[PDB]
């Protein structure tokens, strides 16, 4: 039964779906817990914009870095070898970039981050209520109502309209981004099915072979290290550990401990 | 099942995650237990500073002591030998410093600590009625208001502005530290990949050799240590 779970774990679509669901849940928890939408007139666009970008950037970097094989790819970087490196890089990038795309999409769909983000950028010259011959209190109240300040002075309905407008735009952006992303994927796949010299079945076989041989060589290296250490003990103490020791014992002296300290 | 649990323990990804969850949960109760946000006018910046870094620092002290490897490194120290040790030191450092920033980040993103830490250093020039030419009550009220003195005397607006601006500063101070930690981890592994003469494939052999070098030798020591004892008893009492 657990073998089936591991088999589905090998399915990349399932692991990417798990990543997307986990990122969406984390974003929802973060928004519901620790956002608070600071309401300062001076720099409020900064807070929302940072909330939009920094989590996406750190998730992208984490996805790129958590894959060990990309380090080897870069080391080789720093014919067919170039094509294979490009294919592996694209395949790893896909999973590296799925999560930040999910974060951006869900944030835009929710709309709160964009709502608090570009709120002071709203156009109010159309509305005749906001005269503000001072020209400064207008920006103050504009940044002030979207966060938590109702300020029930007839402006609330206006503010909702403004909010609605921004929210509407947010949704579009999300979907717009989504559209572009999908388009990119398609053309990206085109490259992976146009510049690739290997057959479609050849690529999957080759990847399975690479994973098999990597695991096999790791196991072989561990076993070789184990055998080398076993040999070191059977040459120092004169007996093989884990076997019948009642035959001989070296009884090493003080000078013998220094020899095994070399590695 | 149980073997799977130990097998996943070998991987270092879960080890970092396991420590992170414990720190946040204990902090969420400890911060609400005996923190209480005091408003010591004379010295409250000490209060915020003490329980923002020091409880994280002891984990680093614990982290170094939790590994028997670095004691041997100190003994050898007190070349290729340094190159291998430096990689081990980096790997030891990687698993040892995750916890202190873990608690540091969540406190910064919480915003409760900084409010009670650097309230007295805030700027009061904007508000026109924190004049206080005597320059005595201003320090006290600035370092007295945010704790439990709501003071609905036409100053609550400042207390929201001060807290929110600091909380934004607290929130902004959060990721920036997160960003630098990610940056340092990225280059250090890249440095460890280029500076180390051994290939990553050859790195696996050596690292696997390190993890079983402690076990096999220790097992040999135990068998030899015991077999001596019975032969002493044979001479003493004649019992195996």
């Amino acid at each position: 039964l657990n073998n089936i779970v591991s088999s589905l774990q090998r399915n990349g679509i399932f692991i990417n779906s798990l990543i997307a669901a986990l990122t969406i849940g984390g974003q929802q928890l973060f928004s519901s817990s620790t956002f608070s939408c600071p309401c300062q007139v001076g720099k409020n666009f900064y807070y929302g914009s940072a909330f939009l970008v920094i989590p996406a950037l750190i998730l992208l970097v984490a996805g790129f870095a958590l894959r060990s094989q990309m380090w080897t790819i870069t080391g080789e970087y720093c014919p067919l070898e170039c094509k294979l490196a490009c294919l592996r890089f694209f395949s790893i990038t896909g999973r590296a970039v799925i999560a930040p795309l999910t974060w951006l999409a869900v944030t835009l769909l929710t709309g709160t981050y964009y709502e608090c983000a570009a709120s002071e950028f709203a156009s109010v010259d159309h509305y005749p209520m906001f005269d503000n011959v001072s020209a400064s209190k207008r920006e103050e109240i504009l940044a002030g109502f979207p966060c938590c300040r109702s300020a029930p002075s007839d402006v609330i309905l206006v503010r909702d309209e403004i909010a609605l407008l921004h929210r509407y735009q947010s949704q579009m952006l999300g979907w717009i981004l989504i559209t572009l992303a999908t388009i990119a994927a398609l053309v990206s796949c085109c490259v992976a099915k146009c510049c690739s010299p290997l057959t479609s079945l050849q690529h999957c076989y080759w990847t399975s072979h690479l994973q098999n041989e990597r695991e096999l060589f790791e196991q072989a290296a561990e076993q070789h290290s184990r055998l080398l250490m076993m040999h070191r003990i059977k040459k120092l103490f004169g007996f093989i550990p884990g076997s019948e020791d009642v035959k001989h014992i070296r009884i090493p002296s003080c000078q013998d401990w220094k020899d095994i300290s070399v590695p | 099942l149980n073997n799977i649990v130990s097998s996943l323990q070998r991987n270092g990804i879960f080890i970092n995650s396991l420590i992170a969850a414990l720190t946040i949960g204990g902090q969420q109760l400890f911060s609400s237990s005996t923190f209480s946000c005091p408003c010591q006018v004379g010295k409250n910046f000490y209060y915020g500073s003490a329980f923002l870094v020091i409880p994280a620092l002891i984990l680093l002290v614990a982290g170094f002591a939790l590994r028997s490897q670095m004691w041997t490194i100190t003994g050898e120290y007190c070349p290729l030998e340094c190159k291998l040790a430096c990689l081990r030191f980096f790997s030891i450092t990687g698993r040892a410093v995750i916890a202190p920033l873990t608690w540091l980040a969540v406190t910064l993103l919480t915003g409760t600590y900084y409010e009670c830490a650097a309230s007295e250093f805030a700027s009061v020039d904007h508000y026109p009625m924190f004049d206080n030419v005597s320059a005595s009550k201003r320090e006290e009220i600035l370092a007295g208001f945010p704790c439990c003195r709501s003071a609905p005397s036409d100053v609550i607006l400042v207390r929201d502005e001060i807290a929110l601006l600091h909380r934004y500063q607290s929130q902004m101070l959060g990721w920036i530290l997160i960003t630098l930690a990610t940056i340092a981890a990225l280059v250090s592994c890249c440095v460890a990949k280029c500076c180390s003469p051994l290939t990553s494939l050859q790195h696996c052999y050596w690292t696997s050799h390190l993890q079983n070098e402690r076990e096999l030798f220790e097992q040999a020591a135990e068998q030899h240590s015991r077999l001596l004892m019975m032969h002493r008893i044979k001479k003493l009492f004649g019992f195996i």
Binding site: - | Q40, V61, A65, H224, L228, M229, L236, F239
Partner: protein, 230 residues
């Protein structure tokens, strides 16, 4: 728990509320380990300060953990400074609103401030002392591990041989008294398997008891006071 509020007497409780329950825990630790009596035996019969701290600190964990956890609640320290006619009312606060508010926060502020000092001291002590002793000790940790395992296997086998060697003794005397032995099923082969040759002399066991720190002879490593007795 119980928090007395009497003026000029609460500070007595705070010391008793933590110090007395802490020290008894320390006493339990030294009693349970058998290493303390080894030093007592060695001094009775006859540079060893490094060994004393190693065993003393091992039992120090239980008294230490009680001291900090009590300060974590913090009600212990609120009695101390508050006590030091209106002063009595301050002690009645945990049991003139401006006067009581300022002192109460001051007490809790100092309570955790003093509470975390020991933890910082603890980390330094467990770190520096462990490092210096190993550096001071000429033997390597591999030798130290073998030294520890030599002692670890010593006590389990001595207890194992003590019990068996006791039965082969006691059975003889009761046999001389009654005329037979009502030994159990598993113990029937015990007498036959190990017929003891007699009772060993008292000074013979006295020599192997005491403190021993690697007094190597002729290049042959020796680890225990019984080891040199061979």
């Amino acid at each position: 728990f119980h928090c007395p509020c009497s003026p000029a007497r609460n500070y007595l409780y705070g010391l008793a509320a933590i110090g007395v329950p802490a020290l008894v825990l320390f006493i339990i630790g030294i009693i349970l380990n058998n290493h303390t009596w080894n030093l007592v035996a060695e001094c009775q019969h006859r540079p060893t300060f490094l060994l004393l701290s190693s065993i003393l600190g091992r039992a120090a964990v239980a008294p230490v953990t009680w001291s900090v956890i009590s300060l974590l609640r913090g009600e212990a320290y609120v009695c101390a400074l508050s006590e030091f006619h209106a002063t009595e009312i301050l002690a009645r606060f945990p049991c003139l609103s401006d006067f009581r508010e300022e002192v109460s926060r001051r007490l809790r502020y100092e309570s955790q401030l003093f509470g975390w000092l020991l933890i910082g001291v603890v980390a330094i002590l467990v770190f520096l002392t462990k490092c210096l002793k190993h550096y001071c000790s000429p033997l390597s940790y591999r030798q130290e591990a073998y030294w520890a395992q030599y002692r670890a296997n010593e006590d389990q086998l001595f207890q194992r041989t003590a019990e068996v060697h006791s039965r082969v003794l006691a059975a003889n005397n009761v046999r001389r008294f009654f005329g037979f032995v009502a030994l159990n099923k598993d113990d029937e082969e015990l007498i036959a398997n190990f017929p003891v040759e007699g009772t060993q002399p008292r000074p013979q066991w006295n020599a192997i008891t005491g403190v021993y720190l690697y007094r190597e002879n002729q290049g042959l490593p020796l680890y225990s006071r019984l080891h040199k007795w061979a």
